[PDB]
Amino acid sequence: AVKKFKPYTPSRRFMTVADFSEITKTEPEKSLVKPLKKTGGRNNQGRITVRFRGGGHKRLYRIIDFKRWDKVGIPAKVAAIEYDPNRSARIALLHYVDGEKRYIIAPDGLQVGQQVVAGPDAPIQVGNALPLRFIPVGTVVHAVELEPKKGAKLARAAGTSAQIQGREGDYVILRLPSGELRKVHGECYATVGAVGNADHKNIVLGKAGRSRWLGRRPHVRGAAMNPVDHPHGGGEGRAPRGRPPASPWGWQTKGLKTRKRRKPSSRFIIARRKK
Amino acid sequence: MKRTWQPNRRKRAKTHGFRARMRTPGGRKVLKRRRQKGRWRLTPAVRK
RNA sequence: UGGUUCGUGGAGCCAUGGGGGAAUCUGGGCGGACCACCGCCUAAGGCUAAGUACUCCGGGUGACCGAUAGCGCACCAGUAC
RNA sequence: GAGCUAGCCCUGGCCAGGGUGAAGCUGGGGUGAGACCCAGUGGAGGCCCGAACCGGUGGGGGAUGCAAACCCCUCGGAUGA
RNA sequence: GAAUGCCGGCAUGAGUAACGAUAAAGAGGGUGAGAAUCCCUCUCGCCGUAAGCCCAAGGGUUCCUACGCAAUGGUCGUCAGCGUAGGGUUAGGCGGGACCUAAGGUGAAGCCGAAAGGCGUAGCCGAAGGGCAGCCGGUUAAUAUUCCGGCCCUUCCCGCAGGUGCGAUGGGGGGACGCUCUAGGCUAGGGGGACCGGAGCCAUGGACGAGCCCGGCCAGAAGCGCAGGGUGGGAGGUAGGCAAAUCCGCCUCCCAACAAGCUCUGCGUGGUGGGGAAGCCCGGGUGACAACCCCCCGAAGCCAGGGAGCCAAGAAAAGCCUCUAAGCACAACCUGCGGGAACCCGUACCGCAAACCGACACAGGUGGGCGGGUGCAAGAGCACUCAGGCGCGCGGGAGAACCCUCGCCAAGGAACUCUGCAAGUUGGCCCCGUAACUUCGGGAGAAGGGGUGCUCCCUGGGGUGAUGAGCCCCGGGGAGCCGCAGUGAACAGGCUCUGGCGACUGUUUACCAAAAACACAGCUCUCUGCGAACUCGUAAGAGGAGGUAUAGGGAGCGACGCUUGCCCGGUGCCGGAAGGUCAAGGGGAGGGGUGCAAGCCCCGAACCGAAGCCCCGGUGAACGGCGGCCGUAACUAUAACGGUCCUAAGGUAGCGAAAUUCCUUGUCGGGUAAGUUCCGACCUGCACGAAAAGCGUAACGACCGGAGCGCUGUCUCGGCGAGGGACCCGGUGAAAUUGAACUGGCCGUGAAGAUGCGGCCUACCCGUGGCAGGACGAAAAGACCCCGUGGAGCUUUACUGCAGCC
RNA sequence: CGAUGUCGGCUCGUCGCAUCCUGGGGCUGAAGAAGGUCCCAAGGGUUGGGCUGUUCGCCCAUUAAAGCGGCACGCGAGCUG
RNA sequence: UGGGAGAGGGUGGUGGAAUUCCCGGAGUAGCGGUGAAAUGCGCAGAUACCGGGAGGAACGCCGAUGGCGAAGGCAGCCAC
RNA sequence: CCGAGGGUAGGGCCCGUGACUGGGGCGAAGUCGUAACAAGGUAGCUGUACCGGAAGGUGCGGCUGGAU
Ligand SMILES: O=C(N[C@H](CO)[C@H](O)c1ccc([N+](=O)[O-])cc1)C(Cl)Cl
Ligand SMILES: [Mg+2]
Ligand SMILES: [Mg+2]
Ligand SMILES: [Mg+2]
Ligand SMILES: [Mg+2]
Ligand SMILES: [Mg+2]
Ligand SMILES: [Mg+2]
Ligand SMILES: [Mg+2]
Ligand SMILES: [Mg+2]
Ligand SMILES: [Mg+2]
Ligand SMILES: [Mg+2]
Ligand SMILES: [Mg+2]
Ligand SMILES: [Mg+2]
Ligand SMILES: [Mg+2]
Ligand SMILES: [Mg+2]
Ligand SMILES: [Mg+2]
Ligand SMILES: [Mg+2]
Ligand SMILES: [Mg+2]
Ligand SMILES: [Mg+2]
Ligand SMILES: [Mg+2]
Ligand SMILES: [Mg+2]
Ligand SMILES: [Mg+2]
Ligand SMILES: [Mg+2]
Ligand SMILES: [Mg+2]
Ligand SMILES: [Mg+2]
Ligand SMILES: [Mg+2]
Ligand SMILES: [Mg+2]
Ligand SMILES: [Mg+2]
Ligand SMILES: [Mg+2]
Ligand SMILES: [Mg+2]
Ligand SMILES: [Mg+2]
Ligand SMILES: [Mg+2]
Ligand SMILES: [Mg+2]
Ligand SMILES: [Mg+2]
Ligand SMILES: [Mg+2]
Ligand SMILES: [Mg+2]
Ligand SMILES: [Mg+2]
Ligand SMILES: [Mg+2]
Ligand SMILES: [Mg+2]
Ligand SMILES: [Mg+2]
Ligand SMILES: [Mg+2]
Ligand SMILES: [Mg+2]
Ligand SMILES: [Mg+2]
Ligand SMILES: [Mg+2]
Ligand SMILES: [Mg+2]
Ligand SMILES: [Mg+2]
Ligand SMILES: [Mg+2]
Ligand SMILES: [Mg+2]
Ligand SMILES: [Mg+2]
Ligand SMILES: [Mg+2]
Ligand SMILES: [Mg+2]
Ligand SMILES: [Mg+2]
Ligand SMILES: [Mg+2]
Ligand SMILES: [Mg+2]
Ligand SMILES: [Mg+2]
Ligand SMILES: [Mg+2]
Ligand SMILES: [Mg+2]
Ligand SMILES: [Mg+2]
Ligand SMILES: [Mg+2]
Ligand SMILES: [Mg+2]
Ligand SMILES: [Mg+2]
Ligand SMILES: [Mg+2]
Ligand SMILES: [Mg+2]
Ligand SMILES: [Mg+2]
Ligand SMILES: [Mg+2]
Ligand SMILES: [Mg+2]
Ligand SMILES: [Mg+2]
Ligand SMILES: [Mg+2]
Ligand SMILES: [Mg+2]
Ligand SMILES: [Mg+2]
Ligand SMILES: [Mg+2]
Ligand SMILES: [Mg+2]
Ligand SMILES: [Mg+2]
Ligand SMILES: [Mg+2]
Ligand SMILES: [Mg+2]
Ligand SMILES: [Mg+2]
Ligand SMILES: [Mg+2]
Ligand SMILES: [Mg+2]
Ligand SMILES: [Mg+2]
Ligand SMILES: [Mg+2]
Ligand SMILES: [Mg+2]
Ligand SMILES: [Mg+2]
Ligand SMILES: [Mg+2]
Ligand SMILES: [Mg+2]
Ligand SMILES: [Mg+2]
Ligand SMILES: [Mg+2]
Ligand SMILES: [Mg+2]
Ligand SMILES: [Mg+2]
Ligand SMILES: [Mg+2]
Ligand SMILES: [Mg+2]
Ligand SMILES: [Mg+2]
Ligand SMILES: [Mg+2]
Ligand SMILES: [Mg+2]
Ligand SMILES: [Mg+2]
Ligand SMILES: [Mg+2]
Ligand SMILES: [Mg+2]
Ligand SMILES: [Mg+2]
Ligand SMILES: [Mg+2]
Ligand SMILES: [Mg+2]
Ligand SMILES: [Mg+2]
Ligand SMILES: [Mg+2]
Ligand SMILES: [Mg+2]
Ligand SMILES: [Mg+2]
Ligand SMILES: [Mg+2]
Ligand SMILES: [Mg+2]
Ligand SMILES: [Mg+2]
Ligand SMILES: [Mg+2]
Ligand SMILES: [Mg+2]
Ligand SMILES: [Mg+2]
Ligand SMILES: [Mg+2]
Ligand SMILES: [Mg+2]
Ligand SMILES: [Mg+2]
Ligand SMILES: [Mg+2]
Ligand SMILES: [Mg+2]
Ligand SMILES: [Mg+2]
Ligand SMILES: [Mg+2]
Ligand SMILES: [Mg+2]
Ligand SMILES: [Mg+2]
Ligand SMILES: [Mg+2]
Ligand SMILES: [Mg+2]
Ligand SMILES: [Mg+2]
Ligand SMILES: [Mg+2]
Ligand SMILES: [Mg+2]
Ligand SMILES: [Mg+2]
Ligand SMILES: [Mg+2]
Ligand SMILES: [Mg+2]
Ligand SMILES: [Mg+2]
Ligand SMILES: [Mg+2]
Ligand SMILES: [Mg+2]
Ligand SMILES: [Mg+2]
Ligand SMILES: [Mg+2]
Ligand SMILES: [Mg+2]
Ligand SMILES: [Mg+2]
Ligand SMILES: [Mg+2]
Ligand SMILES: [Mg+2]
Ligand SMILES: [Mg+2]
Ligand SMILES: [Mg+2]
Ligand SMILES: [Mg+2]
Ligand SMILES: [Mg+2]
Ligand SMILES: [Mg+2]
Ligand SMILES: [Mg+2]
Ligand SMILES: [Mg+2]
Ligand SMILES: [Mg+2]
Ligand SMILES: [Mg+2]
Ligand SMILES: [Mg+2]
Ligand SMILES: [Mg+2]
Ligand SMILES: [Mg+2]
Ligand SMILES: [Mg+2]
Ligand SMILES: [Mg+2]
Ligand SMILES: [Mg+2]
Ligand SMILES: [Mg+2]
Ligand SMILES: [Mg+2]
Ligand SMILES: [Mg+2]
Ligand SMILES: [Mg+2]
Ligand SMILES: [Mg+2]
Ligand SMILES: [Mg+2]
Ligand SMILES: [Mg+2]
Ligand SMILES: [Mg+2]
Ligand SMILES: [Mg+2]
Ligand SMILES: [Mg+2]
Ligand SMILES: [Mg+2]
Ligand SMILES: [Mg+2]
Ligand SMILES: [Mg+2]
Ligand SMILES: [Mg+2]
Ligand SMILES: [Mg+2]
Ligand SMILES: [Mg+2]
Ligand SMILES: [Mg+2]
Ligand SMILES: [Mg+2]
Ligand SMILES: [Mg+2]
Ligand SMILES: [Mg+2]
Ligand SMILES: [Mg+2]
Ligand SMILES: [Mg+2]
Ligand SMILES: [Mg+2]
Ligand SMILES: [Mg+2]
Ligand SMILES: [Mg+2]
Ligand SMILES: [Mg+2]
Ligand SMILES: [Mg+2]
Ligand SMILES: [Mg+2]
Ligand SMILES: [Mg+2]
Ligand SMILES: [Mg+2]
Ligand SMILES: [Mg+2]
Ligand SMILES: [Mg+2]
Ligand SMILES: [Mg+2]
Ligand SMILES: [Mg+2]
Ligand SMILES: [Mg+2]
Ligand SMILES: [Mg+2]
Ligand SMILES: [Mg+2]
Ligand SMILES: [Mg+2]
Ligand SMILES: [Mg+2]
Ligand SMILES: [Mg+2]
Ligand SMILES: [Mg+2]
Ligand SMILES: [Mg+2]
Ligand SMILES: [Mg+2]
Ligand SMILES: [Mg+2]
Ligand SMILES: [Mg+2]
Ligand SMILES: [Mg+2]
Ligand SMILES: [Mg+2]
Ligand SMILES: [Mg+2]
Ligand SMILES: [Mg+2]
Ligand SMILES: [Mg+2]
Ligand SMILES: [Mg+2]
Ligand SMILES: [Mg+2]
Ligand SMILES: [Mg+2]
Ligand SMILES: [Mg+2]
Ligand SMILES: [Mg+2]
Ligand SMILES: [Mg+2]
Ligand SMILES: [Mg+2]
Ligand SMILES: [Mg+2]
Ligand SMILES: [Mg+2]
Ligand SMILES: [Mg+2]
Ligand SMILES: [Mg+2]
Ligand SMILES: [Mg+2]
Ligand SMILES: [Mg+2]
Ligand SMILES: [Mg+2]
Ligand SMILES: [Mg+2]
Ligand SMILES: [Mg+2]
Ligand SMILES: [Mg+2]
Ligand SMILES: [Mg+2]
Ligand SMILES: [Mg+2]
Ligand SMILES: [Mg+2]
Ligand SMILES: [Mg+2]
Ligand SMILES: [Mg+2]
Ligand SMILES: [Mg+2]
Ligand SMILES: [Mg+2]
Ligand SMILES: [Mg+2]
Ligand SMILES: [Mg+2]
Ligand SMILES: [Mg+2]
Ligand SMILES: [Mg+2]
Ligand SMILES: [Mg+2]
Ligand SMILES: [Mg+2]
Ligand SMILES: [Mg+2]
Ligand SMILES: [Mg+2]
Ligand SMILES: [Mg+2]
Ligand SMILES: [Mg+2]
Ligand SMILES: [Mg+2]
Ligand SMILES: [Mg+2]
Ligand SMILES: [Mg+2]
Ligand SMILES: [Mg+2]
Ligand SMILES: [Mg+2]
Ligand SMILES: [Mg+2]
Ligand SMILES: [Mg+2]
Ligand SMILES: [Mg+2]
Ligand SMILES: [Mg+2]
Ligand SMILES: [Mg+2]
Ligand SMILES: [Mg+2]
Ligand SMILES: [Mg+2]
Ligand SMILES: [Mg+2]
Ligand SMILES: [Mg+2]
Ligand SMILES: [Mg+2]
Ligand SMILES: [Mg+2]
Ligand SMILES: [Mg+2]
Ligand SMILES: [Mg+2]
Ligand SMILES: [Mg+2]
Ligand SMILES: [Mg+2]
Ligand SMILES: [Mg+2]
Ligand SMILES: [Mg+2]
Ligand SMILES: [Mg+2]
Ligand SMILES: [Mg+2]
């Protein structure tokens, strides 16, 4: 439930902020944080390799448990639900009866005080992790490993989820958040339910400064530049593209497909996304 | 207005100093060159 | 592909990045595509003075300069600046 | 060569005073319960006036300058990109 | 003898401009060969959120004292940041190192690259961040938290005593954190005192006073008091914290809980040790046995790791504490006390500047802290002043033009001009009051008004205290006084109406453009399934991202509202296992050379054989494009209607003489006495039009048009006055330029614009202040233009390659 | 072309006369008054506004009249821009 | 108090038929459509037939001249 | 002191008037087509939506004031 402001400044007219309703704890677990080295889009050569990055609010990285097949059979209590600035989803603090403390991505509907568990024999319940082959067909799932024991790669953003569509040998068929139909190996882990914080898509940044807070420096249009800079640069006055629209590096950018032809995972993608 | 020389002893020593010069192939050519020319100082003096 | 006088030329020879891949003298390379004949040579291991080059240094000599010349510097110069 | 300048990274510092008065909270009214209205409380904002600080709008001076971009008057921002 | 030649020397301009902020000077007395310029005294003026003081950087002896004045100093010089010489910088506690980590840099392992080298985990380096023990006063010509005095404290070594399972680079705790707002109690700092101390003073009409003037503290160990931070105790289980663990984490039970208890800071007190003014008399002495007290104001600093709210969600590591492992428990650790030990470097001085960056003793530039008082609503604003520091390193006269900065002005009041450019006006606070329109916030300080000093009298509430007095803070009513005028000086909006463009706050061409340009939230298309796409790199490796389609890249549009039409024939992109074309390679019909021959060697057809291209489709918020001629209505005119040609399809809505309209000052209306601009209409739109978006739109704008009111030296039309220059005298003394010059007017002539030729006219020699018509005056080997088989940036369906991708 | 600054305005003039006014005339389809047309005449004079960058032009209100040209389309080491 | 009929309303489950698309099979010269046609689709293998899968929407028979609601209106089945 | 009213500034209601623009009513014999009345030759009408020289057409849902 996004929160609105009255128009007492030009920008407050449109600004919207998250409700932070589900959050129950407002400082992070000290043994689960480490410093996040802001890059500013620079690589080890110091070169900008991703334009328009830098100058956002300082952040600490929260360590997230993307395996969970670490602790099979060991139940854990949902102790808190917290804000994570490194991702769109909220995160959940788990107190394992082991005594160990971990963080997971917070699924939709997960309540503080409930218990979750991971393993082949876990109850099909929101927040439980299982190898894909043991989840019933048609179960909405998230935080999906892509290859067995390699780590949850799929459906981690606020509100997203994949749905189990069927089985074939050692493999399951998932409809991904994008709508692609892909085979994923049945021993890959996943967590029942969809990621939480689904209202995240309807936040209205509201003003330029809000983009700056997030680390997003201003984006400059190619048509605003000069020919030394960009295919779309130059022209007396304003100008249309006057050529197939192009990136700064000359490649075409209105429909030109870019997945590499002979990729081995092609044998595992059934249907490309749609829409 | 603010001009272009803003002296800074650490900066001078870390940029042009002897150990900066020795670390790099071009730097050592500078020292060999200035020795062959017979310069009295191979490197800019900075009080440290 | 390079090297050679040889820039694809009738283009051999020497070298070799890729593929295929021998034999031990009755073996093998060369004589400018190739073939025959006639001859020359013995690859895929290594070393080897002297005659040749240069001039920081020393000395000898100039139909070489003589302080705006001769080295940037005859002098506390690769200095002052 | 980034001791000028541009961007980013790490770590510190600075922004007189005054003005406006959001949400929320509380009490009151209202209703089946509500929405909602009123008062007080509150102290939000690329909010307002204005020094420091950062600028450089108009005009005048200066023009072998005080200055290879300065001086006077005036003017923009001043809790935020 | 010339090359705007090179190097050097010396002229001209010229005793000219200038002598670097208009904060300002006068006199007396010293010194000396010499004095506006040095030293002393008195008077004057200037800064005082500095033009005073203290740190950091940078500079590197410039510091102090003696002796000097050739040069440096924009003049002078006896002076000096100058010359010569001598002296001067003192630390266990301040800063840095023998501690820690940040970005980053480096880098056993490892990875990569023709060579050089490029990466890289731990580790190591790296600070103005963390951590860590000293405060007040005195002393020197010159250093002082450093020397000395008083009172405190830290680490290391050894020993004594008491205590304990001691022990680490390992486990754990802690260190450890944002922005805004903010409580209580204090401290810094300040104001007042009829109280305490003090050398004196009585003037010129009055005052011997509850008079004037000066001052009334600082540091302090334990203890104590006030105020705050921090922190549950115990037991049982335990599989987690990469070994172990009694520690921590998880679970259960009892107890305690807005406390207390323990602990840790701040402030107060505190044995004791210091300081101590005016004035007077030579930095000193006296004052002085100085006194050292009460009240108020009160931080942004301190208690602090305090509290609340919010979203953009806010370093690390060591010190420290706890846990155990090897080990060892003659040890070792902890606590108390004692003796010993405690190193290296910096320390002078300048430091918003004459010592730093600007070639200069240069009106510029330079980070942190302190920055008093009174009044003005507040304040670091403004005026004046304290302490402290200065009068800016040429002066003396004169009182022209003209220039700069400043003041005033009769009548008029924008008539000035491209333009009200500039300058007036308005101007703070309190009260009354306030329009269209609107996104309901605003528009708004709208507009427009009234009040503002002083005296007396009556009175309401707060803070401190005690509830009172006193001091301090907000007010209310009534009566009076004076002036031209009461924010009496200084600081301090002119207003309104109406279009264009851009939503807005922001950003930009350092040094001619600040905008309508860029950005911006927001909208759409598109790529990307993660060893993602994409970017940098030969690579390794990075970024993307320790992210995962509510995400990341690319592109255009640009808040918001209402909308965004038709064309897929060409170009692009996307889809298409057919067909057509298609390289290396495979295949080998059939030929050829040579040999006696077995053979060796060369050419080689059908047929098979990728991507790409051809072909078939799709696709516009992909590149793009969206017609001509002729006829027609019962007045005329004009065509709802029709005919035909062409196209891939013939521009919809909305807007329109427009930031677009050539003819054009289109035509009509408005505003004006008069309007090529403006506003509103019309539509034959030379040449609008829908995300290179179309039409609107409240608020916003140092953007650009048009108008009105207010007020003005802008103007009719100029006048006067001020100061700094200009001018004159003394001192110091440039510059570009310069074939040489004994350098006039006219009308002609001349390479076509003559001081220099012809003819005539005019004209004694030489200066000084002024003005700019000429010397085709100076400056810069024309930027425009052309030429050169000159150059460089940029483009593409120019050529030819290369990366990259297939 | 080793530089002759280029529109308009402002300021400052000065000259020509093919004369706009004022002075002197002839002719008239000149009754008077007022004009028309030509001759002589350059002494003096020849206004203030609205629009536009404008020169020019139109318009408003007047006037004896609201002249036309040259001087590097006079004049930027005189100003504006 | 005790009974009843009902597509009355809200929420969440869930069942079969059909249409469309996708994969596999088998098969070949047309399919579709109309008044008649054409556009279109089809040898790059369509239509017609079989197995499999995905997804949305609506509930055949019961059904009525029926029922319920204040009206608008309410129809697979199940629970609250 | 109050005070006719004069002056200044800003609002509210009403009236007249305005380039141009919107539809409306009326007008013996204009141009275009044929929407409705019969099943009016696609039953009509309806709220709304979108489109078109014009009546109208089409979509969704409703009515019978629909015929056979
Ligand atoms: O170019 C200029 N003048 C040159 C003299 O060398 C010449 O007088 C000139 C002036 C104007 C011009 N024009 O207007 O076309 C042409 C040449 C000056 Cl604008 Cl710098
Ligand atoms: Mg809002
Ligand atoms: Mg609102
Ligand atoms: Mg939440
Ligand atoms: Mg940590
Ligand atoms: Mg990184
Ligand atoms: Mg690096
Ligand atoms: Mg590097
Ligand atoms: Mg990028
Ligand atoms: Mg970047
Ligand atoms: Mg993310
Ligand atoms: Mg989150
Ligand atoms: Mg898999
Ligand atoms: Mg979004
Ligand atoms: Mg951020
Ligand atoms: Mg963005
Ligand atoms: Mg942009
Ligand atoms: Mg551009
Ligand atoms: Mg550009
Ligand atoms: Mg470039
Ligand atoms: Mg290019
Ligand atoms: Mg390009
Ligand atoms: Mg272009
Ligand atoms: Mg352009
Ligand atoms: Mg442009
Ligand atoms: Mg254009
Ligand atoms: Mg355009
Ligand atoms: Mg184009
Ligand atoms: Mg392109
Ligand atoms: Mg590519
Ligand atoms: Mg896909
Ligand atoms: Mg600068
Ligand atoms: Mg610097
Ligand atoms: Mg330094
Ligand atoms: Mg430094
Ligand atoms: Mg440095
Ligand atoms: Mg370096
Ligand atoms: Mg160095
Ligand atoms: Mg080398
Ligand atoms: Mg030497
Ligand atoms: Mg060097
Ligand atoms: Mg060769
Ligand atoms: Mg050859
Ligand atoms: Mg080879
Ligand atoms: Mg043998
Ligand atoms: Mg042989
Ligand atoms: Mg042989
Ligand atoms: Mg051979
Ligand atoms: Mg041979
Ligand atoms: Mg041989
Ligand atoms: Mg051999
Ligand atoms: Mg041999
Ligand atoms: Mg030899
Ligand atoms: Mg010799
Ligand atoms: Mg000599
Ligand atoms: Mg010489
Ligand atoms: Mg000589
Ligand atoms: Mg020599
Ligand atoms: Mg020489
Ligand atoms: Mg020397
Ligand atoms: Mg720099
Ligand atoms: Mg501020
Ligand atoms: Mg107010
Ligand atoms: Mg209030
Ligand atoms: Mg609150
Ligand atoms: Mg603001
Ligand atoms: Mg205000
Ligand atoms: Mg500036
Ligand atoms: Mg300026
Ligand atoms: Mg001005
Ligand atoms: Mg200049
Ligand atoms: Mg200035
Ligand atoms: Mg000023
Ligand atoms: Mg201002
Ligand atoms: Mg302001
Ligand atoms: Mg402020
Ligand atoms: Mg000659
Ligand atoms: Mg010369
Ligand atoms: Mg020359
Ligand atoms: Mg010469
Ligand atoms: Mg020379
Ligand atoms: Mg010379
Ligand atoms: Mg000489
Ligand atoms: Mg000389
Ligand atoms: Mg002379
Ligand atoms: Mg002269
Ligand atoms: Mg001069
Ligand atoms: Mg000067
Ligand atoms: Mg001044
Ligand atoms: Mg005097
Ligand atoms: Mg004097
Ligand atoms: Mg003197
Ligand atoms: Mg003297
Ligand atoms: Mg003196
Ligand atoms: Mg002061
Ligand atoms: Mg120096
Ligand atoms: Mg001297
Ligand atoms: Mg002298
Ligand atoms: Mg001198
Ligand atoms: Mg000087
Ligand atoms: Mg003397
Ligand atoms: Mg000293
Ligand atoms: Mg000491
Ligand atoms: Mg040591
Ligand atoms: Mg190396
Ligand atoms: Mg280092
Ligand atoms: Mg270190
Ligand atoms: Mg440190
Ligand atoms: Mg210390
Ligand atoms: Mg101490
Ligand atoms: Mg002291
Ligand atoms: Mg001494
Ligand atoms: Mg912490
Ligand atoms: Mg932290
Ligand atoms: Mg910190
Ligand atoms: Mg914040
Ligand atoms: Mg104190
Ligand atoms: Mg006070
Ligand atoms: Mg255990
Ligand atoms: Mg403390
Ligand atoms: Mg005494
Ligand atoms: Mg502060
Ligand atoms: Mg604190
Ligand atoms: Mg670290
Ligand atoms: Mg043992
Ligand atoms: Mg023992
Ligand atoms: Mg112990
Ligand atoms: Mg040592
Ligand atoms: Mg010192
Ligand atoms: Mg300053
Ligand atoms: Mg100084
Ligand atoms: Mg320089
Ligand atoms: Mg000076
Ligand atoms: Mg004081
Ligand atoms: Mg004030
Ligand atoms: Mg002075
Ligand atoms: Mg001054
Ligand atoms: Mg005079
Ligand atoms: Mg002045
Ligand atoms: Mg005055
Ligand atoms: Mg007066
Ligand atoms: Mg006047
Ligand atoms: Mg007026
Ligand atoms: Mg007036
Ligand atoms: Mg005017
Ligand atoms: Mg004028
Ligand atoms: Mg202008
Ligand atoms: Mg204007
Ligand atoms: Mg004022
Ligand atoms: Mg109005
Ligand atoms: Mg209003
Ligand atoms: Mg208005
Ligand atoms: Mg409006
Ligand atoms: Mg409103
Ligand atoms: Mg007002
Ligand atoms: Mg009053
Ligand atoms: Mg008075
Ligand atoms: Mg009076
Ligand atoms: Mg103001
Ligand atoms: Mg703007
Ligand atoms: Mg703009
Ligand atoms: Mg716009
Ligand atoms: Mg807008
Ligand atoms: Mg702002
Ligand atoms: Mg500029
Ligand atoms: Mg520029
Ligand atoms: Mg420049
Ligand atoms: Mg400018
Ligand atoms: Mg511009
Ligand atoms: Mg601006
Ligand atoms: Mg821009
Ligand atoms: Mg914008
Ligand atoms: Mg979208
Ligand atoms: Mg690359
Ligand atoms: Mg690459
Ligand atoms: Mg990463
Ligand atoms: Mg915008
Ligand atoms: Mg928009
Ligand atoms: Mg833009
Ligand atoms: Mg744009
Ligand atoms: Mg097309
Ligand atoms: Mg097509
Ligand atoms: Mg196409
Ligand atoms: Mg086209
Ligand atoms: Mg339309
Ligand atoms: Mg028009
Ligand atoms: Mg327009
Ligand atoms: Mg146009
Ligand atoms: Mg026009
Ligand atoms: Mg025109
Ligand atoms: Mg007109
Ligand atoms: Mg009119
Ligand atoms: Mg027309
Ligand atoms: Mg476009
Ligand atoms: Mg609106
Ligand atoms: Mg507006
Ligand atoms: Mg603006
Ligand atoms: Mg602006
Ligand atoms: Mg007016
Ligand atoms: Mg004047
Ligand atoms: Mg004067
Ligand atoms: Mg003299
Ligand atoms: Mg001199
Ligand atoms: Mg001569
Ligand atoms: Mg002569
Ligand atoms: Mg002469
Ligand atoms: Mg003469
Ligand atoms: Mg001629
Ligand atoms: Mg002549
Ligand atoms: Mg003459
Ligand atoms: Mg002569
Ligand atoms: Mg002659
Ligand atoms: Mg002559
Ligand atoms: Mg003559
Ligand atoms: Mg004459
Ligand atoms: Mg003179
Ligand atoms: Mg003169
Ligand atoms: Mg002249
Ligand atoms: Mg002149
Ligand atoms: Mg001249
Ligand atoms: Mg000439
Ligand atoms: Mg001339
Ligand atoms: Mg020049
Ligand atoms: Mg040249
Ligand atoms: Mg030339
Ligand atoms: Mg030139
Ligand atoms: Mg030309
Ligand atoms: Mg050519
Ligand atoms: Mg030629
Ligand atoms: Mg060329
Ligand atoms: Mg080139
Ligand atoms: Mg290449
Ligand atoms: Mg020329
Ligand atoms: Mg010349
Ligand atoms: Mg010249
Ligand atoms: Mg008559
Ligand atoms: Mg005349
Ligand atoms: Mg003209
Ligand atoms: Mg005209
Ligand atoms: Mg007359
Ligand atoms: Mg003329
Ligand atoms: Mg002409
Ligand atoms: Mg002309
Ligand atoms: Mg001129
Ligand atoms: Mg000029
Ligand atoms: Mg001019
Ligand atoms: Mg000139
Ligand atoms: Mg001239
Ligand atoms: Mg077919
Ligand atoms: Mg076939
Ligand atoms: Mg579907
Ligand atoms: Mg009257
Ligand atoms: Mg007819
Ligand atoms: Mg019909
Ligand atoms: Mg009909
Ligand atoms: Mg019909
Ligand atoms: Mg019909
Ligand atoms: Mg239709």
PDB file of C-alpha atoms (C1' of nucleotides) in Angstrom, chain A residues 34 39 53 83 87 180 259, chain E residues 313 529-530 544-547:
ATOM      1  CA  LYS A  34      29.484  -6.469   5.678  1.00  0.00           C
ATOM      2  CA  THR A  39      31.797   0.918  -7.601  1.00  0.00           C
ATOM      3  CA  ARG A  53      26.267   5.316 -11.847  1.00  0.00           C
ATOM      4  CA  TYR A  83      14.401  -3.531   5.112  1.00  0.00           C
ATOM      5  CA  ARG A  87      17.424  -5.498  -3.275  1.00  0.00           C
ATOM      6  CA  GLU A 180       9.748 -18.001 -20.768  1.00  0.00           C
ATOM      7  CA  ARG A 259      21.376 -13.779 -27.238  1.00  0.00           C
TER       8      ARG A 259
ATOM      9  C1'   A E 313      18.386   2.369   5.655  1.00  0.00           C
ATOM     10  C1'   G E 529      17.049 -16.721 -18.217  1.00  0.00           C
ATOM     11  C1'   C E 530      22.286 -15.370 -15.555  1.00  0.00           C
ATOM     12  C1'   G E 544      27.057  -5.172 -14.722  1.00  0.00           C
ATOM     13  C1'   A E 545      26.087  -7.330  -9.443  1.00  0.00           C
ATOM     14  C1'   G E 546      27.694 -10.520  -4.592  1.00  0.00           C
ATOM     15  C1'   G E 547      21.967  -7.856  -8.576  1.00  0.00           C
TER      16        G E 547
END
